[PDB]
Structure formats: structure tokens, C-alpha cells
Amino acid sequence: TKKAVAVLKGNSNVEGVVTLSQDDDGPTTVNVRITGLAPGLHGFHLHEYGDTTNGCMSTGAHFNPAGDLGNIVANADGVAEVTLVDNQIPLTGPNSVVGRALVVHELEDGRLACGVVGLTPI
């Protein structure tokens, strides 16, 4: 019943799209497609601020109302495509992640790419 999207870019080759969906206070479904990554595990995190005025560093710290989505895996071609299901990522209420940032890291759980979490049509 509620949806969000983040377009990831940064000072690097890495880019992609993340779509988030949640019904009520239920679990949040995260659909990840990120390209240009070095093969292997990459930390993938909610960060506190949807502030990209200074690249990905201006998004501040790992976000804790939880914010740890774990690793995503890039394949031999630098593509990470995966669907995660997380309970600690609300799109509504006081702890909404709307307007915050999604950040993908150089190393496993160095901010290669990020995007503001924005509203998108239901």
C-alpha cells in the first residue's frame, strides 16, 4: 500500500535502482539492481540523511531508529540483483526511511553510490 524508490549514483562506476514496498506495518520488500560493482560482497545500508550535497559522505551515519540491510552480492559482471525482505524498514510513521539515503559500500558489511529514498506511485 506504500512504495518508495532510490536511484543510486556516486563518485564511481557504480549505479542502480532500489524499489521498496510495504503494506501497513508489515515487512518491507526491497528490490535491488546495482551495476558496476567489483565482484563479491558489498555492504548495503540505510543512512541517516537524504543529503547528497557533498556526494555520499553528506548522507551521514548508518541509520538507527535496523539500518543494516546486510550484504548484497555482485556477480562476475559487477551486477547485484536481489530481493530482500526486512521488518525494520518502515515507509510510514516516526521512523520512516522516506527522505533518508540508501548507500552501497566498497567493502562487505568507501561509499561507491547512494540515493535519496523518494516516494513513487502506489
Add this chain to the structure above:
Amino acid sequence: TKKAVAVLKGNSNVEGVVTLSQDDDGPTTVNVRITGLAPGLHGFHLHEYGDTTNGCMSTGAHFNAGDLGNIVANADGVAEVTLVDNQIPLTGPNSVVGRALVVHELEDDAGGRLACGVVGLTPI
């Protein structure tokens, strides 16, 4: 007591930064700095979706009020201005957080969507 920011980019030379600040449910202060504009008036709008998957077109329609009016680019293509608007909430059901700010090719009704950015949270 609450703040947001949008970094504007698009399929054009236009880019820049907009900060928003609001105490309580009072008036919203909007600081604008956009560069690479043609000299003259440019429509400056809230649009409904912070969705840039299809460039600025995916931000959907102007959203309400959501008409911030015009900004003025100077001879060097720079538009640097502070606006005060009462209908741009940063809290509550109508919050514009996670929506989009869009700067237009033409003066406010507006032609091409030159640049846009998602409205995101920023500290303090």
C-alpha cells in the same frame, strides 16, 4: 526545527541546490541556488514523486501551494534566492519530504523539466 535539502540535476546543463527549513507548522524558508539556466524567469515547482528513474518525467505532476512561483536567473545563468512559503510542510500527512522539486524551461504557467531532485532529510 526541521530541515530538508534537494540536489537538482537533469538532462540539461542545469544543476544546483535547494535547502528548506520550517519551525513547527510555520512558514517554510526555501534557499535556492541553481546554475546553468538561461537568463530570465523559470517556473519552480513541487512535483508529486521523488522518483527520478525516468529522469525528471517520473516525478509525476505538479503537487499541491506546490507552486513556488518563479525564480530569476541572472545574466550568468545563476538563480540565487530565498523564498518564504506557507504551504510547504516538512512534517505531517502533507510533508513534501520524499517528493520532488523541479525547475522548468519556461516561466511559471512551463515547458521542459530542466532539473529536479528528491527532497531529503538533512541535519539539525
